[PDB]
């Protein structure tokens, strides 16, 4: 399995042999814009299983 990793979650950055299916979380840095056109970046964490 070739997965994604890194601070901006670049693709093909972590080759793996076994798939982990337990409660985990990954974090990404999301850059978004508001209705007032103010540019602001986020840092989220996604609890997954």
Partner 1 sequence: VRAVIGSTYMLTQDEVLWEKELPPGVEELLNKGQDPLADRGE
The residue ranges that bind ligand NAD (CB under 6 A) are: 5, 16, 18-20, 23-27
Count CA atoms within 13 Å of residue 12 on its CB side: 0
Identify which of residues 5 and 44 has a Cβ nearer to partner 1 in the complex.
Answer: 5
Bridge partners of 20, per DSSP, are none
Q: What span, in angstroms and rounded, lies between the C-alpha atoms of 34 and 31?
A: 10
# residues contacting partner 1 (CB under 8 A): 5
Smallest distance from ligand NAD to CB 22, Å? 7
Is residue 19 within the footprint of partner 1 (CB under 8 A)? no
């Amino acid at each position: 399995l070739s997965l994604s990793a890194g601070r901006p979650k670049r693709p093909h950055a972590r080759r793996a042999l076994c798939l982990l299916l337990g409660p985990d979380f990954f974090t990404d840095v999301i850059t978004i814009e508001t209705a007032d056109h103010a540019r602001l970046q986020l840092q989220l964490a996604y609890n997954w299983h």
